[PDB]
Design a protein around this nucleic acid. Structure first.
Length: 106
DNA sequence: CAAGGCACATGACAACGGTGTTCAGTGCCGCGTTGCCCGATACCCCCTACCCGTAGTTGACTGGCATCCGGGCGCCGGGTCGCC
């Protein structure tokens, strides 16, 4: 949590370096975008021991959330081809990404 | 009866007979050391579907997350507070 706070501070100094009053709004609408950017980058870059690249990271999170949506809607484990279709990828890429998203066990 | 004269054979005389030798040359016909001619395989070339790093996303959206117990003992040791 506290490292996330520091990374948000980093995004804040970045955003205020790139803010001007020309925008006809408050700070809270401009800075928050860059804070979100910095936190997302940190969570994608230094979260996993076996580091994944950013593109694969968003692949993992998209797969996880859409799979959770499938479970919520259908209430059953969807067929691999079904998940492949909602993702539009192939089943081979599906098993690949599923294996790439594990965590080390101590 | 003795001396001098002619036959046949005889001491050597070389040169053929015939065979097995000295060099020597060159092969004859068995064993070896390196010429082919290829054929494959390692090393250059171009680009391209994808991997990986970076840049933005304008209503606003301003303090988490705690912990929480049935040891239990026992001592050391020092710190803090009390005494005065």
């Amino acid at each position: 949590f506290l490292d996330l706070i520091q990374e948000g501070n980093l995004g804040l100094i970045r955003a205020v370096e790139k803010f001007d009053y020309t925008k006809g709004y408050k700070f809270s609408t401009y800075a928050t975008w860059w804070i979100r950017q910095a936190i997302t980058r940190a969570m994608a870059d230094q979260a996993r021991t076996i580091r994944i690249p950013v593109h694969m990271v968003e692949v993992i999170n998209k797969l996880a959330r859409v799979q959770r949506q499938m479970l919520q809607d259908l209430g059953r484990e969807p067929t691999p081809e079904e998940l492949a279709k909602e993702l539009d990828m192939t089943p081979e890429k599906v098993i690949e990404v599923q294996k790439y998203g594990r965590e080390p066990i101590s």
